[PDB]
Structures are given as C-alpha cells and as structure tokens.
Amino acid sequence: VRIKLLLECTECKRRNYATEKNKRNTPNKLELRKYCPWCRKHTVHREVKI
Amino acid sequence: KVCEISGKRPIVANSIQRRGKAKREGGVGKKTTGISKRRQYPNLQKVRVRVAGQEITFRVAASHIPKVYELVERAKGLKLEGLSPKEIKKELL
Amino acid sequence: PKHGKRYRALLEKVDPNKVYTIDEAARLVKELATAKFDETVEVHAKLGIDPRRSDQNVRGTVSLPHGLGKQVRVLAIAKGEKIKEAEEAGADYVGGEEIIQKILDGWMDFDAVVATPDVMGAVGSKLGRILGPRGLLPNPKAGTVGFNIGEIIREIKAGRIEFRNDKTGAIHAPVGKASFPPEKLADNIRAFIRALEAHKPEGAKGTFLRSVYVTTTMGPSVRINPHS
RNA sequence: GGCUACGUAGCUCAGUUGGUUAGAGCACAUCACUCAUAAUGAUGGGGUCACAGGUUCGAAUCCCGUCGUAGCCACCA
RNA sequence: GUAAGAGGAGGUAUAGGGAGCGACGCUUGCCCGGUGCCGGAAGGUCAAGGGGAGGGGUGCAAGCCCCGAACCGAAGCCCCGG
RNA sequence: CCGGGUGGGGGGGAGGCGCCGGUGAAAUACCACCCUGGCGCGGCUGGGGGCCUAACCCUCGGAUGGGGGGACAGCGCUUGGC
RNA sequence: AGAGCGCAAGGGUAGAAGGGGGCCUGACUGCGAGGCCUGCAAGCCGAGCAGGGGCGAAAGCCGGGCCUAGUGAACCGGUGGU
Question: Which Gene Ontology cellular-component terms appear in the entry (chain B)?
C-alpha cells in the first residue's frame, strides 16, 4: 500500500534505471542505494519521482 | 428564412451544438472519449429604407446591410417612378 | 528645504526617467558622489520572491573582482588549531573558545566572525541573539562556517557582500567608494551582475532583475537597464 | 485531482497583521454570602492554539509540509 | 404552434389559469433538521469571455503559429434567513 | 496610538544639529529600494445610475406623421447551468 | 523438538529456515538448457552462460523473504528516455 508506496532509483551521471519499493512510514528519509546500470559496471544510484 | 440578398438559409441536425463532450488531454484525456449531435441556423433582420419615390422593407443578413445601401445607390441610377412597392424593390436587384 | 541643497542640484541631474546602463552609470554615476567620502555604489537590486519563501532570499557571498577595502577584522573563535590559520589571515584575537565573552560579555569591534563548524555549535548557541539575528553569526553560507572559511577571511577582506531579500530583494552592492572612476566601477558593477545571476531561486516567476538603483550613497541612481 | 473555509480547556467559544500578560460562560474543586437551598463572588486543576517545519531577536497572530472537515466545479484506462 | 400567428380575451385582480378537500355546522395542533418554494447589491467554486506576466518551434533577421500565469468575466449550486 | 509628527505662511536672527557614549531586536541628519495602509493621476479593464431618440417593439379616424416604450425588449450566433 | 520460525493452517525445520554481531545491497544486467502445469491464455522451476558487484583465509553462497495467499490480459492515457 501507499505508505510502503512505489518509487524508482536512478543512477547519477545521467539517467539509468532499476525498479524498487519504499516505506515512507518506516524511517525512510532519502535513498542512495548501490546498484548496476545498463551501461557499465556497478556505480551509484539515487532515488527520485513516483 | 432565406435572406433576400445572398441566399443564406438554415442548417440542421449535423449542423450543430452537438453537445459532444469531446476529447483532449488533461490526464488520460480532458475527459477523454465523449460525443453527441444537434442544430444551427443563420441570422436575418429588417431594413425598411426609404429610397427614391416610395418606402420599401428588407430582410437582411447578419452582415450584408452595406450591400443593401449599395443596392439603393445603384437604384438611384435609373428611373424609379410609379407606385410600385416590391415591384420597384425587385426591379432593383 | 526637504532633501537638502546638495540633493536639489543632484535632483536636477537625475531627470527621474532614465537608465544609463553599467557604462553611463559607471561614469556619470561616478560623478553623482559629491557629498563626502567613499559612497558605496549601492546597487539596489529588487526582484520578486515573496519576502521569505522559507528559503528563497539569496545569501550572495561576493568580493566583486576588485575590492572594498574597509574592515571586518573577523575576530573568530577558531578552537586553537584553527586560530593558526586565521593567524596568517586577517583575524584579530582569534580566541579559540574564550574571546566568546569579548562578544557576549559586551566587547564589540568585529564583523563576519568566520569561527569554525565545531565552535559553530557552541558559539552559535551563545551569540544567537546579537550576531546571527543582526547579521554576523555563521548563517552557514555567509563565510562563517569552516577552516576553508579563512580563505574566505581573505575573501571578506576583499569583500563579503551578503545579498538577501528582506522585503524587496533590495540588496545593496557596496563598492564604488567614490575614488574608483569609470574602470573599477564598470567591472565591479558587472561582477555584481554575475553574482546576481549566480544565486537564483527554484521557480520564482516575475522579474529577476528589476530595481538596480546604483547610487553611490548620497544621491541619484536610476537603474542600469537592469541587465547591461 | 483542482481550488476555498476551518479545526485552541471535559463542554462550547474569543483573543487574528505580532511582541504578551494565551481567554469567556457552563461544568470540577475547598471555601464565601443566606437561619435555609439556590443567585453570585474568590482560588485551583484541565489548554500543550489540527501536528510538525520555516519567517522573526521575540507567532495561536504570517508563507511552507501532512491529515481530518466541508463546499462547488471536476476526474476515474 | 419550427414559425406567422392562434386562443386567453375586444375578458382586466370580485377577473383569467394550477393544485388539494369537497354542502353545511364545529375545526384544523407541534417540527424549517433533508428537500421544494420566496427573498437577499458580502462572499466560496466554476463557463465561454477579457486580458496578457511567462514558454517554445522556425527564418540571418523583419516576421508567423501554438502554449499560458496574476487578476477582472454570469446563470447556477454552496450561502443566509422566511 | 491624544503623543507628537508632517506641511505652509511669517516674525526674528548668527545661530541651530548627526555618530560613538546609552539603551534595546534595531539606532534614529542624510541616501537606495521596497513593503504596510492611504491619497491624486496615467496605460489596460470592468460594476452601477440618469437623460435624449433615431435602431427595434406598440398604437391612434390613411399616418409622409402624432403619442408610448427604448438601446432593454424581439432575433441570429456562441457560453454554462437547471 | 511440544520453543520460535510476520500474518490462516497445512507441510517442514534446532546437522536451521530459528536468534546475536561484522561488511554490505544478487528485490543484479543481457540470455535461458531442459521440466512442472494445462482448453487457451496466465501461472510454477532453474542449471549453466557472459558483465560486474558483496561477503568468505578458503571450499563457496547470492537473479529478495522456509513454501503454499497478498492478485488484473488487452484496449486509453500520464510521465522520463531511445
């Protein structure tokens, strides 16, 4: 449910994608998790948009 | 009716106000989808101008009055005598 | 008598319907300073950001590619080690954690403060009723939080400038100093334009460059085409 | 969805562009006055100004963030 | 009646139309909370409209097309009471 | 805000004032803009009232006109409601 | 092994799935051998492969949760990119 909602992280250094979920209710300030983009190896990743 | 100048007669059915509801984009659409059908017909009016020897009335279009006074103008160019209402009026044009 | 005699002459020089631009402003508004000493070019800049917007009142921190030349002396409360940095910069009695009372126990003579982030906490809590409120204490962007804020001690000695919105954006660029002629005026004003366009809100419509009034400090000013 | 008004003492209600010193009647309280209840007066307990945030040296007095309440338009593959 | 016009009525508020009960005698009580209906020169939301801050495509440009803020636009519903 | 400020007319005259000091959030001549509320106008844009008649509507023994209403009504188009 | 293993119960488990700490982020990317299942459609399982990543002295585990419930084909359109 929206409270857990749905959000998507994106790499820095222009765009890139990967799909995830949140939990605003739970102490979830902001997210900057570490993943891998289509282009190149594992790098950064920032959370943004619905 | 039918204007005594450049025709101009009524328009029906798929003439319109339609109702419709239409479509645009304001989400998935303005309201998306939506549609219907209706009716629509011209203007007309009155110009009972003097001119020449007598008095004469007119059924004019919503933007063709200057043409009427022009008709007056051409009319003067000939001889307009004798008590003949619409008879002179028709002779004009 | 109303605005004085000097300003009535200096009234017959404005013709309150003009522009000048940074050019004619540099020159003729160099002239417009026949009252005393070093009048501060007062670029008075006004825009529109709803006199608070929670966080949209600039901060602008500038030394204007020339120099003021006045004083701040910084003072600073730079926890011993940091004092040393300020000891090569312009900072009177850098007192790591004890000149605090030569601010709090009523002993002025200073500006800026620079301090450190460490003491910021400490020294931000003690003097947050005079310095900060009125203008000095940290404001973590006014060249008053750090050790690289001593390179900023240098920056402030060369000129801090503080641009804030108050109620009209307003801000008063302070150079001119009625001893700079066309040159220094030209490049100072143009620099301030650059900083003006450096610090911009996140979506404030209107004119982010109406009022310029580049008055020295004693007289006329009428705009600068607020752009050129 | 969009825009409007509002939500403060157990009860109901004002103080609203500051800056002071957050109320009013009911009610609870130990008294006071009546020979006698009630009428009314006094002192206390109960605000945590819809919640936080930010503007201010200093907001219940303003902008901002969430909800509940309502109102009209208006959306729903 | 699309309409011209028609009746109403060449009648005029003791008259013309709509609804309930039904001579006559007694008599007709409480509820404006929901709703219908009367009224009301503050206001809330909304139409096209007026307007033009601001954006973009394109031509070297002059230019043209499109998007559109602030704020002013009724009936109405909310509103206030009968 | 009942305390002074703001403005003009004048007498009269060579004399009158601003910082720090002091107080508080702030220091108060002068300069720059802006806000608060206000007042006068200028660009745009509306609400409401009176009058005239010549549009248009009616009416009086043929009326070319006299008399009433009148920019509403009537009508065409478009706008939203019910 | 009657404890616990989020939630219902079944099945299962202390040679761990339970409970404590450390680094992290494999709710990984491009593919998927071959099988469950079966009217279609949808659902179920996963070796290995290659890119790189985390832990491990290592041998090695990792394509979310002990599993079975927590779900909606398509048509339409929003939004960022190619």
Answer: ribonucleoprotein complex; ribosome
